[PDB]
Design a protein around this nucleic acid. Structure first.
Ligand SMILES: [Mg+2]
Ligand SMILES: [Mn+2]
Length: 494
DNA sequence: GACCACGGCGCC
DNA sequence: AAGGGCGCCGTGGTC
């Protein structure tokens, strides 16, 4: 490469080095661009950002997020991770991708920008002909990355003083349970230690081991095992409560307050777009897709996610997206009439534990299942309604437990992959319309979305987002969305 | 201090 | 609903 002066011309690939992975917390240590043969290294990274028109490169969405916290509208566009990930969703990291498609992922910004150019070449080449993957790329994954960049930049508001109060309460009850259990044991021990607990239950007290752990073969102390021993001994219910409280305190109540961003007053996740085997997003640092919901204490934690003052949260949930998608994929004239007729699938068919089990093993269903394994064995991958693929190679393993595990992965992906393609497309469609009404998209939770709207315009945003989500891509069966509205996530009623 | 494997468990 | 998909915690441990 011919090392050239900043700035680069239109359309260059960008490479950048961050002091850490979270773009909302990162310092920009270096910035470069590459096009043709030349590398352009920016003398001053942050000022240099202003001269870009869009982010084009490996991890584009991360640079667009950093740009966005700094006040600049720099959207991402082309990203070789996205194409690689469409080709094989086992392509999740730039290290892997680089090694696979012709480069080395290093820590130097110039070499990353170069790397980007050569990789996109090599990958856009592997997508000539793959016309459905090209479509998910142009119409879903590339535009979506702009939307997730803005969601990440915006963040969600948290009531800290509430969480600090919950924390003291919960520390008090933890103390009650732990004293309870130590006396029952006749001695004190580390209750967060599954090994010392295991000695207590099974060696010291007389209780029956029910399961062994996978990798090392210790007697399990999982919830399953403890539920099975609930009647056997009073120490057990206490341990179950202790686990519950300490899980929620260690994972949500204590750390989340400390992640509030000084400049925004909000919490900012990463929505990872190339992290999953099925085309779902993941969320990390912190994960906001696993905020508690089933227990009382869980629901009190969920009250802590709140709208800005004067706004409201708008929570929208697809009603059994996966069964409805199974109806469309399999074409079972019967299962479709069940949804088209507005009726509750769980009633017409105890039974919920067969509607949901048949995802993993009504005849067009079995037919669908069997055709899926066959095309999986033949081609080596299965696919979604939109043609997203997951390669499942052990479908022909000669060990039954591995083949059968593989079959379960193979069944699952077309339905999970499809529900995901749908939610992804629907975010892409919904985003620009929310902006037009000054509303925000805050979170995605697989088949749910959380938006924030000015109180005055909330019922109208909810009406609009519902129709957009319901009509995203009509299928033999209707997609149903439940909408809720409220001042906190629990009241909004997701 | 950073990283690790494991068991365990939060959500979809 | 979680025989599928995730990410995060503390422990016991290395380096
Ligand atoms: Mg829900
Ligand atoms: Mn599972």
């Amino acid at each position: 490469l011919e090392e050239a002066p900043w700035p680069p011309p239109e359309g260059a690939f960008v490479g950048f080095v961050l002091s850490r992975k979270e773009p909302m917390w990162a310092d920009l240590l270096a910035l470069a661009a590459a096009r043709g043969g030349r590398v352009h290294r920016a003398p001053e990274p942050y000022k240099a950002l202003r001269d870009l028109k869009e982010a084009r490169g490996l991890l584009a969405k991360d640079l667009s997020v950093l740009a966005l916290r700094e006040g600049l509208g720099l959207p991402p566009g082309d990203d070789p991770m996205l194409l690689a990930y469409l080709l094989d969703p086992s392509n999740t990291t730039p290290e892997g991708v680089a090694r696979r498609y012709g480069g080395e992922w290093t820590e130097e910004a110039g070499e990353r920008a170069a790397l980007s150019e050569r990789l996109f070449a090599n990958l856009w080449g592997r997508l000539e002909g793959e016309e459905r993957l090209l479509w998910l790329y142009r119409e879903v994954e590339r535009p979506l990355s702009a939307v997730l960049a803005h969601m990440e930049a915006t963040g969600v508001r948290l009531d800290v003083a509430y969480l600090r109060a919950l924390s003291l309460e919960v520390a008090e009850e933890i103390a009650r349970l732990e004293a309870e259990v130590f006396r029952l044991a006749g001695h004190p021990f580390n209750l967060n230690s599954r090994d010392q607990l295991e000695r207590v239950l099974f060696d010291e007290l007389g209780l029956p081991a029910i399961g062994k752990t996978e990798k090392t073969g210790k007697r399990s102390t999982s919830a399953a095992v403890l539920e099975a021993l609930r009647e056997a001994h009073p120490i057990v219910e206490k341990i179950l409560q202790y686990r519950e409280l300490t899980k929620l305190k260690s994972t949500y109540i204590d750390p989340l307050p400390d992640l509030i961003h000084p400049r925004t007053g909000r919490l900012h996740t990463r929505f990872n777009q190339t992290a999953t085997a099925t085309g779902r997003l993941s969320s990390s640092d912190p994960n906001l897709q696993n905020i508690p919901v089933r227990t009382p204490l869980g629901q009190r934690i969920r009250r802590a996610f709140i709208a800005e003052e004067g706004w409201l949260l708008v929570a929208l949930d697809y009603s059994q997206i996966e069964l409805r998608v199974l109806a469309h994929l399999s074409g079972d004239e019967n299962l479709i009439r069940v949804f088209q007729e507005g009726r509750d699938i769980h009633t017409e068919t105890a039974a919920k534990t067969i509607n949901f089990g048949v995802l993993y093993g009504f005849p067009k269903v079995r037919a669908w299942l069997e055709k899926t394994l066959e095309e999986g064995r033949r081609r080596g991958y299965v696919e979604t309604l939109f043609g997203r693929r997951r390669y499942v190679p052990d479908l022909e393993a000669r060990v039954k437990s591995v083949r059968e595990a593989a079959e379960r992965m193979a069944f699952n992906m077309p339905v999970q992959g499809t529900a995901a393609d749908l939610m992804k497309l629907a975010m892409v469609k919904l985003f620009p319309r929310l902006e037009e009404m000054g509303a925000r998209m805050l979170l995605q939770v697989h088949d749910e979305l959380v938006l924030e709207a000015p109180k005055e315009r909330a019922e109208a945003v909810a009406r609009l987002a519902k129709e957009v989500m319901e009509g995203v891509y009509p299928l033999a069966v209707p997609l149903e969305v439940e909408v809720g509205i409220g001042e906190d996530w629990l009241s909004a009623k997701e």
